[PDB]
Design a protein around this ligand. Structure first.
Ligand SMILES: *[C@@H]1O[C@H](CO)[C@@H](O[C@@H]2O[C@H](CO)[C@@H](O[C@@H]3O[C@H](CO)[C@@H](O)[C@H](O[C@@H]4O[C@H](CO)[C@@H](O)[C@H](O)[C@@H]4O)[C@@H]3O)[C@H](O)[C@H]2NC(C)=O)[C@H](O)[C@H]1NC(C)=O
Ligand SMILES: CCCCCCCCO[C@@H]1O[C@H](CO)[C@@H](O)[C@H](O)[C@H]1O
Ligand SMILES: *C(=O)CCCCCCCCCCCCCCC
Ligand SMILES: CC(C)=CCC/C(C)=C/CO
Lengths: 11, 326
């Protein structure tokens, strides 16, 4: 989920 | 008796001494000293000097950085545009009227300044709700074989405009109304008079449920599911140090976004729920201006939390501000 967290700007 | 009524206003000050005047015609120096109006003008000047450049730079760096023009960032630009409506559609007007001592634009300007100030505040509110829905759909993935594309992000922005228009327009057509509030320098929704001609009771209830309870449940659910998904994904992958770091960072941001949302709208919800319940009481114009302190300041700290704390925006902003090389 690390790639989805970067897309949403959370990580 | 604690107030003075009028055709299109309600001054929270009894007229037993004959000094109360219309907030559209004469200064209101009997409900607050002139320096208190200057302090009101001083705080509005603070929100303009801090709210405009931070929100304008957000729209400016998106034009200069191609990697910022992603569909998941459409709702963040909608938040910046909403804060700009709060600045020029309300903050600048309140700075001007406070220096006069009263609302000098009359009932027509009261509906204009009230429509735009309510619109900008509601677009920003529903933008934080849509942002939580988008992050819940993308991360938690509750929809089998779903890709969040550009067409979904446009609907998310249009959904905020519809919910805001379904909230700021009824006061212009007969459901509740816009009147000067507190120190009679800014206009907003009426919740201090039971004005039966416009059904203020059914509107405050509709506003408390649809535009506060529903957004609060959606944000807690979407972000609650997001913290649960991230914490359980890191539990099944404890060999990755970056996954453990991301789990703590994501959890810390959810706490900040949830607490900041409460600090923004819960004081406006509790005080307006007390003003509308224990109606007609000796409400001080200073007492009126403490939910507005937290809600109006969201034009400053929402970009700090949702833009400046974003790694992509912060890098592009430092580059733009430092002449293009950093
Ligand atoms: C808070 O309470 C204040 C005190 O009662 C009140 O102010 C008064 O408002 C009335 C008007 O409703 C004022 O009455 C006028 O006074 C002027 C000057 O004395 C008179 O000339 C005028 O008479 C007119 O005469 C015309 C002659 O041709 C006639 O055609 C007109 O029809 C009319 O009769 C009125 O007598 C009164 O002076 C005000 N007093 C003070 C101390 O300001 C505030 O409006 C009230 N506040 C709110 C927000 O309602
Ligand atoms: C940034 C621009 C702010 C404009 C400040 C408006 C000042 C209001 O000036 C008004 O003039 C009247 C007639 O002289 C007087 O009653 C008062 O001084 C004042 O109410
Ligand atoms: C290219 O080299 C850009 C130069 C960056 C210099 C940074 C200067 C910081 C200025 C801060 C402005 C504060 C204004 C306070 C107003 C009350
Ligand atoms: C409708 C009013 C004056 C208070 C209701 C609570 C609240 C903060 C709604 C935000 O849209």
């Amino acid at each position: 989920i690390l790639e989805n967290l970067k897309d949403v700007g959370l990580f | 008796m604690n107030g003075t009524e009028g055709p299109n206003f309600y001054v929270p000050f009894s007229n037993k001494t004959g000094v109360v005047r219309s907030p559209f015609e004469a200064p209101q120096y009997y409900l607050a000293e002139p320096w208190q109006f200057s302090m009101l003008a001083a705080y509005m000047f603070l929100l303009i000097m801090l709210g405009f450049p931070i929100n304008f730079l957000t729209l400016y760096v998106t034009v200069q950085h191609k990697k910022l023009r992603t569909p998941l960032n459409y709702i963040l630009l909608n938040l910046a545009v909403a804060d700009l409506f709060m600045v020029f559609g309300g903050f600048t007007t309140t700075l001007y009227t406070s220096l006069h001592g009263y609302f000098v634009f009359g009932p027509t300007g009261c509906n204009l300044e009230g429509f735009f100030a309510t619109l900008g505040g509601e677009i920003a509110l529903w933008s934080l709700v849509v942002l939580a829905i988008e992050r819940y759909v993308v991360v938690c993935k509750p929809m089998s074989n779903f890709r969040f594309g550009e067409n979904h992000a446009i609907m998310g922005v249009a959904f905020t405009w519809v919910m805001a228009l379904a909230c700021a327009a009824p006061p212009l057509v007969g459901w509740s109304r816009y009147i000067p509030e507190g120190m009679q320098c800014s206009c907003g929704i009426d919740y201090y008079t039971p004005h039966e001609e416009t059904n203020n009771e059914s509107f405050v209830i509709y506003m408390f449920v649809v535009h506060f309870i529903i957004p609060l449940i959606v944000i807690f659910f979407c972000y609650g599911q997001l913290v649960f998904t991230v914490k359980e994904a890191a539990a099944q992958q404890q060999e990755s140090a970056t996954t453990q770091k991301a789990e703590k960072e994501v959890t810390r941001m959810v706490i900040i976004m949830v607490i900041a949302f409460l600090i923004c709208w819960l004081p406006y919800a509790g005080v307006a729920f007390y003003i509308f319940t224990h109606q007609g009481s000796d409400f001080g114009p200073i007492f009126m201006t403490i939910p507005a302190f937290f809600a109006k300041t969201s034009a400053v700290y929402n970009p700090v939390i949702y833009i400046m704390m974003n790694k992509q925006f912060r890098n592009c902003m430092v580059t733009t501000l430092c002449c293009g090389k950093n």
